[PDB]
Amino acid sequence: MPVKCPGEYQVDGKKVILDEDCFMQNPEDWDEKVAEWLARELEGIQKMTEEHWKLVKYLREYWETFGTCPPIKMVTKETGFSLEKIYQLFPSGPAHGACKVAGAPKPTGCV
Numbered sequence: 001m002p003v004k005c006p007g008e009y010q011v012d013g014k015k016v017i018l019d020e021d022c023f024m025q026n027p028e029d030w031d032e033k034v035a036e037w038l039a040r041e042l043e044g045i046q047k048m049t050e051e052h053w054k055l056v057k058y059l060r061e062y063w064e065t066f067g068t069c070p071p072i073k074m075v076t077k078e079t080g081f082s083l084e085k086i087y088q089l090f091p092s093g094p095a096h097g098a099c100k101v102a103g104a105p106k107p108t109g110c111v
Contacts, residue, residue, distance in 0.1 A: 030103035
């Protein structure tokens with residue numbers, strides 16, 4: 001693993017905590033520096049393009065209705081994104097990838 005999780009870190013006067021599997025467990029202090037930070041340590045992106053913040057923004061709005069993270073095939077019904085382009089933008093897995101950069105804690109595992 002790239003980041004020794006779980007582990008804590010500091011970014012621009014801020015506190016980011018990472019639980020098992022490097023999961024965001026502090027959506028209260030999420031910002032542009034935190035999202036771009038984890039994305040830079042994982043994908044290596046040094047400058048969040050306009051597409052990353054675009055999809056990341058649409059998801060941030062749906063997380064204010066129930067608090068979950070759907071896939072990327074249903075968001076297209078009201079957006080216009082191509083699964084191919086998103087694939088080259090993410091490491092083959094825009095599902096958990098996007099939500100992760102957004103700062104959404106797991107829904108309800110336990111099985």
